[PDB]
Design a protein around this ligand. Structure first.
Ligand code: S2G
Ligand code: S2G
Ligand code: S2G
Ligand code: S2G
Ligand code: FE
Ligand code: FE
Lengths: 349, 349
């Protein structure tokens, strides 16, 4: 029965992997939040597996289990980083809810009726750690999520760890895919339960898990119609307007058709998040703090002769450009919507 | 009472003008079709009136009563033209209904499920006149509408009449408005009751009435949202999808808000139809055949520095361009609609 046959391939992250030396289940289902949509698993392969190379060349997610990409960082933890990360400033987001929706500040100018559910604040690593402890011991509920690009200002031992990354492997990946340069490395440290809502990036991403576990739920670019991203000029550009915890099927009917790809990554796993793929990321409930470092690369330059039909991500690119052009022409982003409706109502719908 | 005050300025063409020498009412109300929308009158002025110049400079319709634009052609009629128009071919449209919706043949390729309610056929003027008589005496109901650009091939006396047009006046109009060159002169001869459905042109137009009477109903460019033009790639591009005789308020709800500008033009009147203004044109019921010659001019070049806010016609221009671009990018016009809906549903509506 196809219905049942399907209810089966809709595993999710699957049965929890077992830790070496019989240290028990890495994590368990009750640590995962519950959503309204189905999900099949992202393949977990070895970098030496020809399949893994296949998925990447073909822009599909895959978790590489043995890259040693950030092997030297697997020793990182709060104590170690405070002693060696530097006296530099670290962007730290604070929020009331478990949801840390990203917002673009340079865009906060066009939409003033927008109020951030989470606020940013610069800190010295020890401050973040301090504030983390107050909350921790005082049993508070304020959630924090440090997210900072690793810059010229980190300490000596961190720079050392950095040099020990597996540049041989990734550089070859950058080379074989024609990608552009590495644009940055984002360091993320969050509290258990922290959620990064579904959104997509215009960067190729190698997501290297370091400490703790993270459940990653991705959606292919062709599910744009089911995820309803905010307007291109809105601060939450690229983020989904749908609240996965309380989805509004009236406003977002096609979210009822969404199908995800998930997996739980841990210390040493590297998840390839292809450019334009939506991803929702959550730190397992009661799993402790999580540490991750990503590698963002500019995508490869678009082929000179366009081949048809277009790939989903090229249509998404086209839609974004229309919204931007219209923004410039009308001289005001607020008017994009009204003109678009006028263009389709009774004509294309 | 504003409601009443308004029910009054909603005259229409107004009281029928009286013919010189007490020859009676030029025409009467029962000769006008009945529609669901209100209309105020287009001003009837003298070319020497500073107001007339005001409306034209400001791109608003006006009927000039004394231009002598086509004074020499006021003698034209079927007999005269057959003897002097030429042996050239004349495009003649035939239709079952009184509505002569224009269709672009070069575009009939993308929409094959489109069937012309009226068909074109080349003829020698005498043929058109012959076919006109058969129908006429045989009491048939097949309607014909000759519409042909006046070309290099017209007879000597017609070329003479042409030279006697008031080029001094119009050339000065072309000059003062910065318009481009005269692109053409369309000759129109239709049967009583013939209707040209609401549509807009991307040409400045001086509409010179010659024989018979025509009721002209125009709408400002900012009523785009009430008139629902077909998709830009459709054969009926620029025409309204709304059937003025049987309007579908379900599909076209805003047609309930449409307000027209009308007038009845006769022998010697010249109606200025500004670029992008919608116009519906009908030959009075039982008024005999009608003859008109238009003057189409390219519009003036768009100012180098764009001033805000945009004028309605600039937004219409913007919408058309979006539809065309999307057509090229997707490599197929049929897909424009689906992408536009995906772009607005749950995001901008
Ligand atoms: O100073 C900051 O926190 C921003 C650093 C910037 O993202 C970079 O290093 O390129
Ligand atoms: O790990 C998170 O919570 C956010 C990850 C971020 O979206 C990325 O693209 O690396
Ligand atoms: O030959 C025809 O009927 C088309 C003539 C063309 O419109 C022109 O004269 O520019
Ligand atoms: O007079 C007609 O029936 C059609 C007139 C045509 O739309 C024009 O722009 O001159
Ligand atoms: Fe991301
Ligand atoms: Fe026209």
């Amino acid at each position: 029965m196809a219905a049942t046959a399907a209810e089966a391939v809709a595993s999710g992250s699957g049965e929890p992997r077992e830790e070496a030396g019989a240290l028990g289940p890495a994590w368990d289902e009750s640590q995962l939040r519950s959503y309204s949509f189905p999900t099949r698993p992202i393949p977990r392969l070895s970098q030496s597996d020809p399949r893994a190379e296949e998925l990447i060349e073909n822009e599909e997610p895959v978790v590489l289990t043995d890259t040693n990409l950030v092997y030297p960082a697997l020793k990182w933890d709060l104590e170690y980083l405070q002693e060696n990360i530097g006296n530099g400033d670290f962007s730290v987001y604070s929020a009331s809810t478990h949801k840390f929706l990203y917002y673009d500040e340079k865009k906060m100018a066009n939409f003033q009726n927008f109020k951030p559910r989470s606020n940013r604040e610069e800190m010295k690593f020890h401050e973040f750690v301090e504030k983390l402890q107050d909350i921790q011991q005082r049993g508070g509920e304020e959630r924090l999520y440090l997210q900072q690009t690793l810059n010229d200002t980190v300490g000596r031992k961190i720079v050392m760890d950095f040099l020990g990354f597996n540049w041989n492997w990734i550089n070859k990946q950058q080379g074989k895919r024609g990608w552009g340069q590495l644009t940055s490395n984002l360091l993320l440290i969050g509290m258990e339960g922290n959620v990064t809502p579904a959104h997509y990036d215009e960067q190729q991403n190698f997501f290297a898990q370091i400490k703790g576990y993270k459940r990653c739920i991705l959606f292919p670019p062709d599910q744009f119609e089911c995820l309803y991203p905010y307007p291109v000029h809105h601060p939450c550009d690229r983020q989904s307007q749908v609240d996965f915890d309380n989805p509004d099927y009236e406003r977002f009917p096609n979210f009822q058709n969404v199908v995800g790809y998930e997996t739980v990554v841990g210390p040493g796993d590297v998840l390839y998040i292809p450019m334009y793929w939506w991803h929702h990321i959550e730190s397992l409930l009661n799993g402790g703090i999580t540490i991750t470092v990503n590698f963002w690369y500019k995508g490869a330059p678009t082929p000179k002769r366009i081949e048809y039909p277009l790939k989903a991500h090229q249509k998404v690119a086209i839609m974004r450009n229309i919204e931007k052009m219209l923004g410039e022409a009308l001289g005001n982003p607020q008017e994009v919507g009204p003109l678009l409706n006028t263009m389709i109502k009774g004509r294309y719908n």
